[PDB]
Write a protein that binds this ligand. Structure first.
Ligand SMILES: Cc1cc2nc3c(=O)[nH]c(=O)nc-3n(C[C@H](O)[C@H](O)[C@H](O)COP(=O)(O)OP(=O)(O)OC[C@H]3O[C@@H](n4cnc5c(N)ncnc54)[C@H](O)[C@@H]3O)c2cc1C
Ligand SMILES: Cc1cc2nc3c(=O)[nH]c(=O)nc-3n(C[C@H](O)[C@H](O)[C@H](O)COP(=O)(O)OP(=O)(O)OC[C@H]3O[C@@H](n4cnc5c(N)ncnc54)[C@H](O)[C@@H]3O)c2cc1C
Ligand SMILES: O=c1ccn([C@@H]2O[C@H](COP(=O)(O)OP(=O)(O)O)[C@@H](O)[C@H]2O)c(=O)[nH]1
Ligand SMILES: O=c1ccn([C@@H]2O[C@H](COP(=O)(O)OP(=O)(O)O)[C@@H](O)[C@H]2O)c(=O)[nH]1
Lengths: 393, 393
């Protein structure tokens, strides 16, 4: 007589699974998760290459990092973490540079050693065109942090291949993802906690969706089955984590997305580049970076006669393409505001919530996605499924 | 009527304290430790600089590292460890290079990026003068590993200032302390476990000598009091960890030692070199390296208007100088063999054991010293103090 499920979740990414796991274990409710991909985990899905055994991140490399202790403690319930610290090198004019901004990069590019004090002065001179506080876009913000000469050499070219958009049109928050230091610290991230899942990403994601009150239906599009499912559970809300503009059939227009293509190759050598990730900042090369996955897990002993590499290509996401990056131009932010209104309306009429990287058109990382899911649970979903509180304020 | 103590230990270094702690806690025996320095811990003694609060390693920088899990588990009984990974940079011709041997150093010194495969070929050509298996001394071993061009630039000069001895006379084991890689890994050590004592070295050493059955007498030379002490405990053995040649009053001759002088300076700036340790490989500079101790503990937030640095100078250890490094030339190894005979004799006549860096004329690290102390306890001291087994085989 009663309801089949207590909640619908669309997408088995870190946002969806976090939501599904909290509702199931803490509130003791049945959750149905719908994934149209052949597997779970979203873009965090990993897979072992048959010849080498090396774990391959299928949808781009994934490195976990956070400063939120609550998030850190939460994710450790489902997996252990290695003490791996992510470092990136940059390729420019046939030379590998230390990266990102630091005394290593400065002394290499400018030919001599600069003291921390001397380095600050050098950059201050080259960044005299614009102040950081008055930075509107990516180009201005980048120059105000690392100076114009370094901007032309390591930022302008890479940004061209990655976004294919005028640097003066891109958000400043994009370049502020990279730490700016005046030491020899070349850690690509600056968070308290950092590491890779010891037994791989897939094992991690399978532990979150392991509860018996969580059912996951793979190869299932929500728009194909929502007509039949929701009548079975009329009171059950829906957490949507797919493309926001797709949900409304692009009625207001199409948001700018960037998508990625990957070339995976097994090489008959033991080491290709001697590091995990190598950025290619020059335009004489079509790909943005190359991953060598064996350097992600040095604690594991892989064969030394073969190796797996992955080249990364960037282009505009079209009709049926899976979106990866929100471009977020001024025109995009305008269109986004319209969809947020339509989304706010859908929440009041049919109990449909919007979250995640794709569902909010946000440049989110794994830990930001999980934290966002925890906040949605604590403030919105839990008071509703437990105390009858409406979804809207 | 009975004996005052069950064991005498000379020197409060890591060897002595490890011995004293094991005997006291496991065998329930009274141990007297004699230290002629004003404090305990030997050269591992740390001290907070008053103006900045920064922990200063008084007798040279100390970084703990090991692959022995038994040692690792043992030391964690007395202290916690940070996740600090030691990295060294090299200064050559006004330029800071990545260090030690790796793709970073190669691509910097030779001006362009070398693949792991290309790098192996380049070094193989430059190391064609001598094979590594047939390496007798430091100079030959160094060339056979990193090639002659890199040897002249980063090894030959540094070795000159540090040892003031012909590179063909020094042991090959000296240069094999540094890892030789063909990746971008610039970790100065290659051990499984590594870190710094969270609450400092002195707190660590005080926890080992904390047991009530261990008495430590500071400012006391063993040669001044052994005439009065040993009659009080005739059955008690003695573990000597001081200079081996000094114990026999240099009767057979003087072993070659290197000693160190330090210049500690508080600077009115927040950062001097942006890294923990900077090697100076050129001869136009008197000191071998510079330490900036604030980069040893990034987890602590020190003031940013002042900093503490320490320059390190090397010279021959004379009469009353405290020895730091055994030179171990062919002449030294000959003289050493003589003292080992005299030492083997002293063990049989007056129950005097010899151990530690100074007591064995060995280039030992902290973990090698502790492991050595554990082996002496398990095989020699424990069967004697508990089962009456003689000290000699
Ligand atoms: C190349 C790349 C590298 C990254 N590296 C890092 C990193 O190193 N560290 C870090 O912290 N973050 C990294 N991220 C970011 C991170 O992957 C995201 O935070 C993460 O994907 C968050 O999950 P999400 O569920 O909000 O989005 P997604 O996990 O992509 O979840 C969305 C899922 O919804 C499903 N779906 C969509 N529409 C439907 C539908 N109609 N019906 C059914 N299912 C649907 C899709 O199958 C998709 O799998 C990286 C991202 C990319 C693209
Ligand atoms: C500059 C430097 C840097 C180093 N860095 C590292 C590092 O980063 N990581 C690492 O693992 N190892 C490092 N080491 C090595 C490490 O310090 C030694 O392993 C360590 O000192 C071992 O202790 P030990 O007791 O065998 O020698 P010591 O600790 O020097 O102990 C000897 C003690 O005996 C006492 N003594 C001597 N004679 C008498 C006497 N007649 N009467 C009373 N007392 C006496 C002395 O006071 C002395 O303190 C470094 C060494 C040096 C010199
Ligand atoms: O070598 C680089 C790396 C970063 N970026 C810029 O910084 C942004 C964020 O870089 P990040 O590596 O964080 O992007 P992601 O890992 O998500 O692909 C990119 O979009 C680029 O615009 C750059 O210009 N040069
Ligand atoms: O930049 C360097 C560092 C090391 N060495 C040689 O390698 C030996 C050991 O170096 P290490 O840093 O381990 O010595 P320590 O830290 O004990 O002073 C030194 O004696 C030198 O002969 C060198 O030639 N160049």
């Amino acid at each position: 007589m009663t309801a089949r499920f207590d909640l619908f979740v669309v997408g088995s990414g870190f946002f969806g699974l976090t939501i599904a796991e909290r509702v199931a274990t803490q509130l003791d409710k049945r959750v149905l998760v719908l994934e149209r991909r052949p597997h779970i985990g979203g873009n965090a899905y990993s897979e072992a290459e048959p010849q080498t055994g090396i774990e391959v991140h299928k949808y781009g490399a994934h490195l976990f990092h956070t400063s939120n202790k609550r998030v850190w403690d939460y994710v450790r319930q489902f997996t252990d973490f290695t003490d791996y610290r992510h470092r990136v090198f940059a390729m420019h004019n046939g030379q590998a540079y230390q990266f990102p901004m630091g005394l290593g990069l400065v002394s290499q590019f400018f030919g001599k050693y600069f003291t921390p004090e001397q380095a600050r002065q050098l950059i201050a001179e080259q960044a005299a065109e614009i102040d950081t506080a008055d930075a509107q876009n990516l180009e201005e913000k980048a120059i105000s942090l690392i100076g114009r000469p370094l901007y032309e050499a390591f930022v302008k070219g890479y940004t061209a291949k990655q976004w294919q958009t005028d640097p003066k049109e891109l958000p400043a928050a994009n370049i502020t993802r990279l730490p700016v230091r005046y030491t020899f610290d070349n850690r690509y991230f600056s968070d308290t906690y950092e590491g890779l899942p010891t037994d791989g990403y897939t094992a991690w994601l399978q532990n979150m969706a392991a509860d018996h009150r969580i059912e996951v239906r793979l190869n299932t599009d929500w728009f194909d089955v929502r007509g039949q499912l929701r009548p079975g559970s009329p009171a059950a809300p829906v957490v949507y984590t797919g493309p926001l503009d797709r949900y409304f059939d692009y009625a207001e227009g199409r948001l700018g997305w960037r998508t990625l293509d990957f070339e995976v190759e097994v090489l008959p050598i033991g080491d290709f580049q001697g590091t995990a990730v190598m950025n290619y900042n020059d335009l004489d090369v079509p790909y943005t970076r190359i991953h060598e996955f064996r350097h992600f897990h040095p604690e594991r002993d892989y064969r030394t006669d073969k190796t797996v590499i992955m080249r990364e290509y960037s282009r505009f996401a079209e009709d049926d393409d899976e979106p990866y990056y929100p471009i977020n131009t001024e025109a995009d932010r305008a269109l986004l505001a319209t969809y947020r209104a339509r989304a706010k309306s859908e929440t009041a009429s049919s109990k449909v919530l919007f979250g995640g990287r794709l569902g909010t058109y946000q440049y989110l990382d794994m830990h930001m996605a999980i934290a966002s899911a925890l906040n949605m649970y604590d403030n919105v979903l839990a008071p509703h499924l437990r105390d009858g509180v409406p979804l809207l304020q």
